[PDB]
Amino acid sequence: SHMAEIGTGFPFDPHYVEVLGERMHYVDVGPRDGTPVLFLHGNPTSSYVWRNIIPHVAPTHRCIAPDLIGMGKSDKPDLGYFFDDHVRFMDAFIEALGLEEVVLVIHDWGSALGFHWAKRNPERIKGIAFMEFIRPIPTWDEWPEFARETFQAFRTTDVGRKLIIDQNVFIEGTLPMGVVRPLTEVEMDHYREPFLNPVDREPLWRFPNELPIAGEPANIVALVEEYMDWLHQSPVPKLLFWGTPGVLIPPAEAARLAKSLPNCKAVDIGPGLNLLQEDNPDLIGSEIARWLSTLEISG
C-alpha cells in the first residue's frame, strides 16, 4: 500500500507568549483539561515539522508546539544561541503556559531540550516519544559518511560561517539531506521563511558547533551524558522512532536502545534520515496516538 499525500499546509492558529522579555510563537490545539503533549523541534526546523503529526494527536490530547527562540516565528534577540540560551527560554516557555505534568515528543536539538528538562523535572514527565536525538558521538566514524565532511566544515573556523550564515547551506543543503523524499517548493519556502536575512542564521551555525562530537564541546558532552544516564535508569514510558539509514541514530543504535532503555518501544518508520516526520508522518502520528492511550494520563 501507499502513504497518504503529505500535507504542505500549516492550518494552525498562531499564538505568542512573552518569555523573558521576548515573544515565542507556538501552536496550541486540542482539549485543555488533560495532560499536554509538548512537541519540540530542532535544527533547522520549526513547529512546521510537526504539522502532519499533530492532527493524529489533537483529537484526544492537547498539542503544544513552540518555535525555539531565534527560530520559526519566535523573536530573534541578539544571543549566541548556545544550548544554554535555548534551555533558558524553553524552561521559561513551559512555566509561562503554567504546564505541570507533560508528555514530550522531541526531535534533534529539541530532544536535548526535552531530555535535559525531564532529568531536572522527573516528577513532571509522563512519557517521552523521541527520534533522531542528540547523544554523544565519540568519534567522527560514528557520524554518517555522507555528512562527515560537511559537519566537519560547519565546525571549522571561518569556513562554517561562510557556508551556514552567508550561503544558507543548512537550509538549502543540510535540510534536504535530512529527508529521504524530496521536499516540495512550498515546504522549502516554509522552512526558509525565518532565515531570509543572513543575520538571523546564528542558531543554524551554533547548533552544529554544540553537537557532542569527539569530546567537544566538553560541557555539552557532560550534559548529554547526564541525561542519557538518567534515561537509561528511568521507568518513564518511552517511544523511539527510527529509520534507515538515519543520521544521529543508525538502525544498530536504535536496536541497542530498544533493550537498554527501560519501558521502551521502538518503531521502524522505513527509509529515513533526520526529519523522520517528513518521511512517514502518518506512522509516527498514529503510533504516538496509540501509545498515549496506554499512558497514565487523561487528566
| Single residue of 33, 218, 233, 235 touching Na ion by CB under 5 A | 218
Which is closer to Na ion, CB of 25 or CB of 135?
25
Q: Which residue's C-beta sits nearest to Na ion?
A: 218
Q: Tell me how far, at minimum, the Cβ of 154 lies from a second copy, in Å.
A: 13
Burial 33-52 (b: 16+ CB within 10 A, else e): ebbbbbbbbbbbbbbbbbbb
Which is closer to a second copy, CB of 154 or CB of 191?
154
Rg, Å, the chain Cα set: 18
Is the separation of the CB atoms in 83 and 210 below 8 Å? yes
Which is closer to Na ion, CB of 103 or CB of 183?
183
Cell output for 91: 524552561
CB atoms within 10 A of CB 235: 8
Q: Tell me how far, at minimum, the Cβ of 236 lies from Na ion, in Å.
A: 25
Interface with Na ion: number of residues (CB under 5 A): 12
Q: Tell me how far, at minimum, the Cβ of 19 lies from a second copy, in Å.
A: 12
Which is closer to a second copy, CB of 156 or CB of 298?
156
Residue type, 104: L
Instruction: Tell me which residue of 72, 79, 140 sits closest to 110, measured CA to CA.
Output: 72
- Which spans of this chain sit near a second copy (rule: CB under 8 A)? 21, 77-80, 82, 84-85, 88, 91, 157, 202, 219
Which is closer to a second copy, CB of 6 or CB of 79?
79
Q: What does 216 interact with, of a second copy, Na ion, none (CB < 5 to 8 A by kind)?
A: Na ion
Q: Tell me how far, at minimum, the Cβ of 183 lies from Na ion, in Å.
A: 5
CA distance 284 to 299: 23
Which is closer to a second copy, CB of 91 or CB of 226?
91
CA distance 24 to 17: 6
Sheet holding 15-19, edge to edge: 15-19, 22-29, 63-66, 37-40, 102-108, 125-133, 238-245, 264-272
- Which residues from 1-20 bind Na ion, rule CB under 5 A? 9, 11, 13
Q: What does 179 interact with, of Na ion, a second copy, none (CB < 5 to 8 A by kind)?
A: Na ion
CA distance 106 to 114: 6
Give me the residues that bind Na ion (CB under 5 A), please.
9, 11, 13, 29, 176-177, 179, 182-183, 216-218
